[PDB]
Amino acid sequence: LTIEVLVTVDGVNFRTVVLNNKNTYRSQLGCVFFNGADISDTIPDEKQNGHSLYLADNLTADETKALKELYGPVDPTFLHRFYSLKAAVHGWKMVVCDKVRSLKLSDNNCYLNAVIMTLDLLKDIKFVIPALQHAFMKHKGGDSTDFIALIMAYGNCTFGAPDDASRLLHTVLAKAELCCSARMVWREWCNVCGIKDVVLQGLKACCYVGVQTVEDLRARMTYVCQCGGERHRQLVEHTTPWLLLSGTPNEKLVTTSTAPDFVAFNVFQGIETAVGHYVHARLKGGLILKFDSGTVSKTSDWKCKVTDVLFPGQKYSSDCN
Amino acid sequence: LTIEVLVTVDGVNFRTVVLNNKNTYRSQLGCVFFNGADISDTIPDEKQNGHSLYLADNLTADETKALKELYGPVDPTFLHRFYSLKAAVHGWKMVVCDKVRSLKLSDNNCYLNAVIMTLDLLKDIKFVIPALQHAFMKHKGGDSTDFIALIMAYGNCTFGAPDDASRLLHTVLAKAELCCSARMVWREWCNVCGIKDVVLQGLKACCYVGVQTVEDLRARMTYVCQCGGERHRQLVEHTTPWLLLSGTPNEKLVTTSTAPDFVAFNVFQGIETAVGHYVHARLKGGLILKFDSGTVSKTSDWKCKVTDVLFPGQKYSSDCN
Ligand SMILES: [Zn+2]
Ligand SMILES: [Zn+2]
C-alpha cells in the first residue's frame, strides 16, 4: 500500500512524496509533525493520504532555501524546537485587562510576559524575518501562539525553565528594524589628543545597556587619557522614536508624583530566592500598574529592582558654555 | 577619598579610572565584577586601589572593539552572563577515567557532558573566536571552567536548566572552522528536467541533521517532480576528516559484534519522564563505554535512543551502472 502526502517547511511551498505503509515516516522521509505532534516513529496510514506534513530535517535544497527565506539562517534543530514549542505554548493563556494583554503565569514564563508587554509598547518597528513579522501581526490581532513559540525558538528558551528577560528583548530586537530615522552620537575627547565621534543609527540608537535613566545616559564620564591627562565620553546628540534602557536589577524608589518621562519598566524580584520573578510595570492615569503575569496592582510609589526602562522619543543636542 | 582601578573587558587592554568612595561602582562606572563577584552595588574601598576590574556594561568605544575582537559580536547581556556562569561552573567537577574526561552530574548539566565529550573527539577544528579557542586549549590542558562557561554563554544556557545537546553541539561548531579540506556533493535530478549539484565545504560538509548512519546518508530519495515524473536526491561525493550525524532520539540496537565504523554516539533517556537525561557513549576495546556524567558502564549490545553519532573521515564517490 502507498500514499501521497504534501510536505512543507513553510506552509507555502509543498512537495508531493509517495510513502508505503511498511517503514516509519522517519525511515522514509525524516522527522515530521502533523497537527502539532511528532509522528516520525509511526507508520504511514491510508488515513493521512492527501494530507500536509511539516518536515523538521532532511530537507531538500528547495526546502533549505524556503526555510532561510521564511525564518532566516537558523540552526539545524530550529524547526524541531519551534514545532514542539508551538504545541506546548498552546496550552498557555493571554488575558486582557482594560485592553492591555498579559501572559498568565505558567511553566516559569514570567520573563516572557515582561518581554511581550515591553515589545507591545514599541512604535515604528518591523521584523526583518518574515515568520516573525507575520507572527507579530497575528499576535497584535489576538492570536499569540506562534509569536511566543518563535521568540522562545529564536531565544533558545527551554520550555519550563526561567530565563533572562533583558537577554530576550535584546535578541528579539536584533531581528527588527526601525521604520523611521534614529540617531545617537557619542563624543569621546581629550583637550590635548583630539575628538572621536561614534554614530549609531536605527534600532541601535534606541537601546542602551548599562544605564536606566536619560540623566545617566547623558552624563559626562571621565578617565585617564593615554597622554597622561583626562579623557571624556559624553552623549552629544540623540534622536529616536523611543528609547529602551537596561541594567542589572537595581533597587530604586519609583514614583509618579514627579510625572517622570518613562512609560514602562520591568522589575526582577528575589535574586537569591532560587533566582526570582519578573513583573512588567506601566505608567498610566498617574499610577504605576504592575502586571504580574496576568494579575494587576496599582500604586503611586514603588521600591523595586528595575531592569529595563522604556522612554518616549528623544530629541537631544548637548549644550554647555 | 579617591582610588585608581584598572578596568578591562578582555584581561589584555586596561584603562585607568579614578573613583571616589561616595557613590557605588554602578553609579560611577557600571556593572563590574571582581574576583568572580558582581560588586556594582558596593562602594569603592581603599583596599581595591590599583586592582583590576572586569566591566560588564557601559563600555567605551575602545572596549566595544576589544569585546568584538575577543568574543565576536555578542548581545549586550553576554559579559554579565559569562562572568556569572564562570563563577557558578567553578563549583563543578571534571573526572578522568583511563584518560577520558567527563563532567560530573550537577545542576542538570548532563547535556554539557554529552557536548564536551563529543567535541573532545574532533580533529582538525579550531574556533574562529579567540576567547573560545583560548578556552578550548585551557580545557585540553585540564582547566575546563572557561570553556564550559563560554559554551553556556554562547548557547544561552540557563544555569540549572536542562538543555538540548544536539542544539549546543551545532551552535558551538558554528563557531569553529576546519583546518583541512572537506567536501560534500548532493545531486538532485530528473531524467527529463536535468541535474542540480549542491556542494558544501569545510565544517558544513562534516555535520548532517536528519540521518544517524552513513548508509542512510548515502541512500537515494525520490519524490514527485514538477514535470509530473520523479525527482531524486542523492549524496554523490563525500570527503571529510570526520562526520557528525544527528536526529531526534531514535531507539536502536547498538552492537559492537559487527565492528561498526562509528566511534561514539549520544543517547537521550526518558522523553516523557519530565524530559530526560543524556549519556555519552564511546567504542573502545570491542565494547560500548557509557559515560553517564562522570560514571562509566560497558556492554557489547545496547538498546537505546540515539541522538548524535560520530563517524571517522569519509572518502566516498557514488557508483552504479
Ligand atoms: Zn590625551
Ligand atoms: Zn522532471
Side-chain angles (χ1 to χ4, degrees):
Chain A
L1 191 141
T2 63
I3 69 171
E4 278 197 342
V5 287
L6 293 175
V7 177
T8 182
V9 306
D10 64 2
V12 175
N13 302 272
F14 297 82
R15 62 169 164 132
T16 305
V17 176
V18 174
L19 299 170
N20 63 62
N21 72 345
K22 321 195 214 338
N23 305 230
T24 54
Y25 277 106
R26 182 199 308 255
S27 321
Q28 295 196 68
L29 186 55
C31 178
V32 284
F33 281 64
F34 175 80
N35 205 49
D38 186 340
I39 63 160
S40 308
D41 286 321
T42 73
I43 306 287
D45 188 270
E46 301 94 275
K47 283 145 194 218
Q48 47 249 195
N49 180 67
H51 284 263
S52 274
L53 295 177
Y54 270 87
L55 183 62
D57 61 26
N58 277 118
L59 304 196
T60 60
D62 293 317
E63 287 162 336
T64 289
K65 181 168 147 203
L67 176 71
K68 297 191 300 267
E69 287 171 7
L70 168 61
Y71 296 110
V74 285
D75 84 277
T77 73
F78 174 87
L79 288 167
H80 186 266
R81 295 179 302 104
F82 171 53
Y83 294 157
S84 309
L85 285 156
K86 188 177 153 154
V89 310
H90 236 119
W92 284 352
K93 179 181 180 176
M94 303 291 304
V95 281
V96 193
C97 319
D98 302 309
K99 295 203 188 303
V100 167
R101 289 186 303 286
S102 192
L103 175 56
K104 275 179 44 58
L105 190 61
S106 169
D107 307 299
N108 281 319
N109 67 3
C110 61
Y111 70 96
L112 289 168
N113 187 60
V115 167
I116 290 153
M117 293 193 73
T118 296
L119 292 168
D120 280 343
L121 292 175
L122 300 167
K123 292 308 140 197
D124 299 302
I125 65 173
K126 191 186 64 286
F127 287 105
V128 304
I129 293 161
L132 257 178
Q133 193 45 30
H134 178 269
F136 194 33
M137 305 299 91
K138 289 213 275 170
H139 159 74
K140 289 303 198 175
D143 176 19
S144 293
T145 300
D146 284 359
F147 186 67
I148 296 160
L150 281 178
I151 288 177
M152 288 177 91
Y154 282 116
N156 290 311
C157 314
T158 310
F159 186 83
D163 214 310
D164 185 329
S166 307
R167 178 187 82 69
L168 250 322
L169 264 175
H170 293 254
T171 54
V172 172
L173 285 171
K175 309 317 218 292
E177 81 190 323
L178 205 60
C179 297
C180 61
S181 270
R183 188 188 179 68
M184 196 187 59
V185 190
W186 294 93
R187 178 170 290 156
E188 289 188 355
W189 78 99
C190 171
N191 296 320
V192 172
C193 302
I195 297 162
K196 192 51 175 74
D197 287 342
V198 187
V199 178
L200 301 155
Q201 321 193 65
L203 275 182
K204 294 198 287 285
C206 307
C207 305
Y208 184 89
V209 175
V211 294
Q212 288 159 318
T213 69
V214 184
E215 291 105 325
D216 296 323
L217 184 70
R218 287 170 177 189
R220 185 181 69 242
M221 174 185 65
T222 296
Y223 53 98
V224 170
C225 189
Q226 59 274 3
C227 64
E230 266 178 355
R231 239 191 106 114
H232 309 280
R233 161 163 184 85
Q234 183 172 330
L235 185 61
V236 290
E237 201 226 293
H238 208 188
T239 167
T240 71
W242 51 254
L243 166 63
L244 164 69
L245 306 177
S246 315
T248 54
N250 180 7
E251 191 205 72
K252 264 162 168 278
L253 198 277
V254 178
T255 179
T256 57
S257 61
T258 166
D261 299 326
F262 51 85
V263 304
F265 58 93
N266 299 315
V267 161
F268 181 73
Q269 283 164 356
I271 70 155
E272 166 77 306
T273 344
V275 210
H277 177 52
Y278 284 92
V279 181
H280 177 76
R282 311 216 169 153
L283 298 219
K284 206 142 67 161
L287 292 169
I288 297 162
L289 320 199
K290 308 137 91 158
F291 289 98
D292 176 2
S293 292
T295 285
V296 76
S297 291
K298 313 163 194 205
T299 183
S300 56
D301 301 86
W302 194 22
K303 188 163 78 171
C304 59
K305 303 164 156 185
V306 169
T307 49
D308 317 291
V309 179
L310 180 53
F311 284 89
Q314 304 289 304
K315 172 124 109 309
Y316 175 69
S317 186
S318 57
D319 215 54
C320 64
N321 299 337
Chain B
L1 191 141
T2 63
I3 69 171
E4 278 197 342
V5 287
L6 293 175
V7 177
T8 182
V9 306
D10 64 2
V12 175
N13 302 272
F14 297 82
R15 62 169 164 132
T16 305
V17 176
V18 174
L19 299 170
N20 63 62
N21 72 345
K22 321 195 214 338
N23 305 230
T24 54
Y25 277 106
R26 182 199 308 255
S27 321
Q28 295 196 68
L29 186 55
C31 178
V32 284
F33 281 64
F34 175 80
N35 205 49
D38 186 340
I39 63 160
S40 308
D41 286 321
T42 73
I43 306 287
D45 188 270
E46 301 94 275
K47 283 145 194 218
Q48 47 249 195
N49 180 67
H51 284 263
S52 274
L53 295 177
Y54 270 87
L55 183 62
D57 61 26
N58 277 118
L59 304 196
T60 60
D62 293 317
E63 287 162 336
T64 289
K65 181 168 147 203
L67 176 71
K68 297 191 300 267
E69 287 171 7
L70 168 61
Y71 296 110
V74 285
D75 84 277
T77 73
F78 174 87
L79 288 167
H80 186 266
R81 295 179 302 104
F82 171 53
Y83 294 157
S84 309
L85 285 156
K86 188 177 153 154
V89 310
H90 236 119
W92 284 352
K93 179 181 180 176
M94 303 291 304
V95 281
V96 193
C97 319
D98 302 309
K99 295 203 188 303
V100 167
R101 289 186 303 286
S102 192
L103 175 56
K104 275 179 44 58
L105 190 61
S106 169
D107 307 299
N108 281 319
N109 67 3
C110 61
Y111 70 96
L112 289 168
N113 187 60
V115 167
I116 290 153
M117 293 193 73
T118 296
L119 292 168
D120 280 343
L121 292 175
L122 300 167
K123 292 308 140 197
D124 299 302
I125 65 173
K126 191 186 64 286
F127 287 105
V128 304
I129 293 161
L132 257 178
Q133 193 45 30
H134 178 269
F136 194 33
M137 305 299 91
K138 289 213 275 170
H139 159 74
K140 289 303 198 175
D143 176 19
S144 293
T145 300
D146 284 359
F147 186 67
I148 296 160
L150 281 178
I151 288 177
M152 288 177 91
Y154 282 116
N156 290 311
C157 314
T158 310
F159 186 83
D163 214 310
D164 185 329
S166 307
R167 178 187 82 69
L168 250 322
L169 264 175
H170 293 254
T171 54
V172 172
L173 285 171
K175 309 317 218 292
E177 81 190 323
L178 205 60
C179 297
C180 61
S181 270
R183 188 188 179 68
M184 196 187 59
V185 190
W186 294 93
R187 178 170 290 156
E188 289 188 355
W189 78 99
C190 171
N191 296 320
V192 172
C193 302
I195 297 162
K196 192 51 175 74
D197 287 342
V198 187
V199 178
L200 301 155
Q201 321 193 65
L203 275 182
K204 294 198 287 285
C206 307
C207 305
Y208 184 89
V209 175
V211 294
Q212 288 159 318
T213 69
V214 184
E215 291 105 325
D216 296 323
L217 184 70
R218 287 170 177 189
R220 185 181 69 242
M221 174 185 65
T222 296
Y223 53 98
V224 170
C225 189
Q226 59 274 3
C227 64
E230 266 178 355
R231 239 191 106 114
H232 309 280
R233 161 163 184 85
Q234 183 172 330
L235 185 61
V236 290
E237 201 226 293
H238 208 188
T239 167
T240 71
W242 51 254
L243 166 63
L244 164 69
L245 306 177
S246 315
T248 54
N250 180 7
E251 191 205 72
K252 264 162 168 278
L253 198 277
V254 178
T255 179
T256 57
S257 61
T258 166
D261 299 326
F262 51 85
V263 304
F265 58 93
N266 299 315
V267 161
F268 181 73
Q269 283 164 356
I271 70 155
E272 166 77 306
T273 344
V275 210
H277 177 52
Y278 284 92
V279 181
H280 177 76
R282 311 216 169 153
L283 298 219
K284 206 142 67 161
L287 292 169
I288 297 162
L289 320 199
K290 308 137 91 158
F291 289 98
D292 176 2
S293 292
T295 285
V296 76
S297 291
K298 313 163 194 205
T299 183
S300 56
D301 301 86
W302 194 22
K303 188 163 78 171
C304 59
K305 303 164 156 185
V306 169
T307 49
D308 317 291
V309 179
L310 180 53
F311 284 89
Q314 304 289 304
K315 172 124 109 309
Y316 175 69
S317 186
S318 57
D319 215 54
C320 64
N321 299 337

